[PDB]
Amino acid sequence: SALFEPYTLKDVTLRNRIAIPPMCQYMAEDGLINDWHQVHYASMARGGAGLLVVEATAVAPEGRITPGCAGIWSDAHAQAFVPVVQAIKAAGSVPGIQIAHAGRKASANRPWEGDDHIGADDARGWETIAPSAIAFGAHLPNVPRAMTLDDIARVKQDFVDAARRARDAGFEWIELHFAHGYLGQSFFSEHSNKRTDAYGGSFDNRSRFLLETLAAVREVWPENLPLTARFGVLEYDGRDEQTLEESIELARRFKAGGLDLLSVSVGFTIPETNIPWGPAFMGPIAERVRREAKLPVTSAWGFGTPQLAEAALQANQLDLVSVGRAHLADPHWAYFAAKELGVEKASWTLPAPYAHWLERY
Amino acid sequence: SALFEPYTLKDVTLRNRIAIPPMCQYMAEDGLINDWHQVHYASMARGGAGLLVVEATAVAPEGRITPGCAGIWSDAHAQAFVPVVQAIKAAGSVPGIQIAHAGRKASANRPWEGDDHIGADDARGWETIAPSAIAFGAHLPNVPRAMTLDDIARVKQDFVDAARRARDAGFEWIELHFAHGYLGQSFFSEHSNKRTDAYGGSFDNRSRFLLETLAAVREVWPENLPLTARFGVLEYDGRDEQTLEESIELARRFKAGGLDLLSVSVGFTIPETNIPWGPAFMGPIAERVRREAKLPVTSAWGFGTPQLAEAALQANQLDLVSVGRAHLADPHWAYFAAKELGVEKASWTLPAPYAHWLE
Numbered sequence A: 001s002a003l004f005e006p007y008t009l010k011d012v013t014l015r016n017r018i019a020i021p022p023m024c025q026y027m028a029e030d031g032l033i034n035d036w037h038q039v040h041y042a043s044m045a046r047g048g049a050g051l052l053v054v055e056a057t058a059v060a061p062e063g064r065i066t067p068g069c070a071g072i073w074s075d076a077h078a079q080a081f082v083p084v085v086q087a088i089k090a091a092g093s094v095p096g097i098q099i100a101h102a103g104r105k106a107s108a109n110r111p112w113e114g115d116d117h118i119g120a121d122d123a124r125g126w127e128t129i130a131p132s133a134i135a136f137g138a139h140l141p142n143v144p145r146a147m148t149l150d151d152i153a154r155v156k157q158d159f160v161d162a163a164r165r166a167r168d169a170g171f172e173w174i175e176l177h178f179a180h181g182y183l184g185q186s187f188f189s190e191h192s193n194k195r196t197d198a199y200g201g202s203f204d205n206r207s208r209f210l211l212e213t214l215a216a217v218r219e220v221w222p223e224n225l226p227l228t229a230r231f232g233v234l235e236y237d238g239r240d241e242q243t244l245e246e247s248i249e250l251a252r253r254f255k256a257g258g259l260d261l262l263s264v265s266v267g268f269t270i271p272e273t274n275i276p277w278g279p280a281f282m283g284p285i286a287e288r289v290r291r292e293a294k295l296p297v298t299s300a301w302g303f304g305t306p307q308l309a310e311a312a313l314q315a316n317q318l319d320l321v322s323v324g325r326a327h328l329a330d331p332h333w334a335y336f337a338a339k340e341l342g343v344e345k346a347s348w349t350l351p352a353p354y355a356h357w358l359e360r361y
Numbered sequence B: 001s002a003l004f005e006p007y008t009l010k011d012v013t014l015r016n017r018i019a020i021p022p023m024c025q026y027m028a029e030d031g032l033i034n035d036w037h038q039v040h041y042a043s044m045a046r047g048g049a050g051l052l053v054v055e056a057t058a059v060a061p062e063g064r065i066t067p068g069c070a071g072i073w074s075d076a077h078a079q080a081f082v083p084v085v086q087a088i089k090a091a092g093s094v095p096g097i098q099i100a101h102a103g104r105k106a107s108a109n110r111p112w113e114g115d116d117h118i119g120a121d122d123a124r125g126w127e128t129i130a131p132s133a134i135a136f137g138a139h140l141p142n143v144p145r146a147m148t149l150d151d152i153a154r155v156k157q158d159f160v161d162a163a164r165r166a167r168d169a170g171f172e173w174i175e176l177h178f179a180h181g182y183l184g185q186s187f188f189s190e191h192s193n194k195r196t197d198a199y200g201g202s203f204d205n206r207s208r209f210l211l212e213t214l215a216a217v218r219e220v221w222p223e224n225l226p227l228t229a230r231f232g233v234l235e236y237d238g239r240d241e242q243t244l245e246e247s248i249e250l251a252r253r254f255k256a257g258g259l260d261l262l263s264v265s266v267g268f269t270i271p272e273t274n275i276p277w278g279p280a281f282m283g284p285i286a287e288r289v290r291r292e293a294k295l296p297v298t299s300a301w302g303f304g305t306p307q308l309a310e311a312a313l314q315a316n317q318l319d320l321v322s323v324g325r326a327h328l329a330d331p332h333w334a335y336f337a338a339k340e341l342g343v344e345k346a347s348w349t350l351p352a353p354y355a356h357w358l359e
C-alpha cells in the first residue's frame, strides 16, 4: 500500500504518507493552548498518522483569526507547545506547526458563534491589517488598515521569531501559512493587493512579501528539517489558467529559496468564486504543480477515503495525503485506512494497548 | 433512538445509553496512571459516551493483574485519577471506576508480552492470594496462597479504602469487580472455592465475601451515587442452569444490599469452558437477570454495532449498552453510532470544535 510507505524529507522520516493538516480548534485563551489541544493532538497522533501539523498559530496577536486562536508570539506561548510536541513524538508521529497571520480575515467570531467579523462595540475585537484597505466582503465586512513598510518589516520579523520559537519547542516540520486568503495569500492576489510600492503591482512585487518572509525564516529554521508552505494556487474566479501559471512560477521561486514541500490549496481570497467541490478534486491541480515546479506536494479537500488517498499516491499526484475532517470524526482514521487497504498487521498502526486487542477483533 | 435517550440512576444522569466498560491499559507503573491514561480516557469521553468506567484498578498491590495495572491503594494513587475525572466530566460524560483484586490471576505478564503467569523465579512477580490453593491452570499455572481470616478482613478494608478514595477523587459511579475469575468471582464459584470455614461450602458461605465487601463499601460510598458491580452469572461449564439460578439469587441479595445496577458478564473462573461467542450473545442472559432479579443491567461481549445496541435496549434486555473494543478502534464511536441511527444533529454528539464541521 502506497499510503503506508514511509517518506523521508531532509532528516525527517514519516512512518506513512498520511498527514493531518492544520485544523484550528478555536479553544485557546490569549493565544495559550490548553488541555483541549493536548488531548486532541495526542489522540490523533496515537491514531497512526505519520505527520501532524498543528493548527494555524498566530505570529502576532492581531494575526489570530479569532479570540480562540493559538499564538506563538512570545516565548511563554512557545513553551506551552512543548508537551504537545513531546506527546506527538511519543506516539511515533512527527510534530509540525503552521505559523500564520490572518490578515483581513482576523478579528472574527468562532465558526459556531457567528463565523463573522466581531462587532466594533465588542470588547474582544481588534484592528486588522492587510496589503490594502479593502474588505473581504460578505460575512467579513471590516476594512483592514493598509500596511506600511514598517509593518511589513515587523510582520516578517514576527514570522522569523515564531519559526525560531517553534524550532526550540521541538517541532520538526514547519509550514508557512500563505494560503486561504489570509495575509500571505492576500499579498499575492490582485483581488486584495492594490499597492503601488515594491509590494504590489507586478508579479515580482506581489511575490515579494512571500519570498522575503520565506527567506527570513530560512535563516533561522534548521537546514535539516523540512521547511514547507501552504499556498492557494487558484481561486476558481474565472482567472484560473493565468492564476495557476503564476502560482506555479512562484512555486519554482519557493524551491529556489529552499522550500522542501508545498501544500497545494485554493486561494479563498474573495467570496465571489465557484469552487467545484468533489472527491479528490485537487488531485489534477496538485499533480500539475508537482510536475511543473518539480517540488514534493501534499493536498487536501476531499481525499479522506482510503481508496482516494491510495489512488492519488499511485498516480504520482501527491507525496503525502492530507486527511483533515476524517480525523475529527475518528482520531484513529489511519488505523481504519490500514484495515481498508489490507495492510499486514493493520491493528499495529495503533499502540499496543489497542493493537493487541483489535488484531483478534 | 433508544441508544440516545438519557438514563437517570440515583442523582446521576447519563446523556445516552452508551457506556464504555472498564478496559485495562497495562500502562501504569507502580499503580500510578500517567499520560497514556489521561489522553486515552479524555479522548473517549469527548467521543460522546454517556458513562466511562475506568479500567480495573487494584485495591492492593498484589491485586493487580500485571505490573502495568492501575492501583488506588494509597491517597497519592487516588490523587493521580483527579485529572482523569475532571477530563471525563469536562467532556460531558460521567466518570466511573472499577475497583478490583485479581486473586489467583494476579502476577501475570501484559497480554502482548506473553499473557501468562510470571515465573516464580522472576523478580517482577509476586505471591498471589485466593480462597483456596488451587491454580486456574493453562497459561496461569501459579498456585495461589489460601487467604487467612486476617487476609479476608484486610482485603475488605482495602475495597473500603479504595471506594473512599474514588469518592473523594470525584468519581460519580463505582463498580465492584466481582467477575471474570478474579478474587470476588473465585469466592463465589465452587470451582475455585474449596474453603471449609464461613467463606466456603454453602451458597451463603460462598456469597459471604461478596456480600460483606458490598456492605462495607456501602458505608463509605454516597447513597446518591450509583453503587454497581460486575458479576459473572454463568461459566459455560456444563452447569449453566444451576449456576445461573444461584447467581440470580445472589443478585437479589445484592439488590437488598443497596446495589443500583449489575454489569452482567461471564465467570471466566476456569479455562475448561465453551463460551458461544457471537453477536449480542449475552442479550438473553442479561434480560433474564434483569427481569428475575429486578435490577437494572448492562452487558457487553458483542453489542458493538449501532443496530445490535439499539435492538437490545428496545427489547428491554439492557438499560445501558457497554461498548468496549469498538471504542479502542474509534474513540468517537458514540458519534458513529449517532450518525448510523439517524440522530438529529448527530455531529453534536461531539464537542463544538468537531461538531461544527462534521454537520
Ligand SMILES: Cc1cc2nc3c(=O)[nH]c(=O)nc-3n(C[C@H](O)[C@H](O)[C@H](O)COP(=O)(O)O)c2cc1C
Residues within 6 Å of the ligand: A021, A022, A023, A024, A025, A055, A056, A098, A177, A179, A180, A230, A300, A301, A302, A303, A304, A322, A323, A324, A325, A326, B353, B357
Ligand atoms: C476545523 C477546521 C480547521 C482548519 N484549520 C486550518 C488551518 O488552521 N490552516 C489551514 O491551512 N487549513 C485549515 N483547515 C483546512 C484543512 O487543513 C483541510 O484543508 C480541509 O479540512 C480539507 O481537507 P479534508 O477534506 O480532509 O477535511 C481547517 C479545516 C477545518 C475543518
Ligand SMILES: Cc1cc2nc3c(=O)[nH]c(=O)nc-3n(C[C@H](O)[C@H](O)[C@H](O)COP(=O)(O)O)c2cc1C
Residues within 6 Å of the ligand: A353, A357, B021, B022, B023, B024, B025, B055, B056, B098, B177, B179, B180, B230, B300, B301, B302, B303, B304, B322, B323, B324, B325, B326
Ligand atoms: C483491553 C481490554 C481490557 C479490558 N479490561 C477489563 C477490565 O479491566 N475489567 C473488566 O471487567 N472487563 C475488562 N474487559 C472486558 C470488557 O470490559 C468488555 O466486556 C469486552 O471488551 C467485551 O465487550 P466488547 O465486545 O464491546 O469489546 C477488557 C477488555 C479488553 C479488550
Ligand SMILES: COCCOC(=O)/C(=N\O)C(C)=O
Residues within 6 Å of the ligand: A024, A056, A065, A179, A180, A268
Ligand atoms: C473558507 O476558508 C477555507 C480555507 O480556510 C481554511 O481552511 C482555514 N484556515 O486556513 C480556516 C477555515 O480556519
Ligand SMILES: COCCOC(=O)/C(=N\O)C(C)=O
Residues within 6 Å of the ligand: B024, B056, B065, B179, B180, B268
Ligand atoms: C479471557 O478474558 C477474561 C475476561 O476478563 C476480562 O475481561 C478482564 N478483566 O475483567 C481482563 C482480560 O483484563
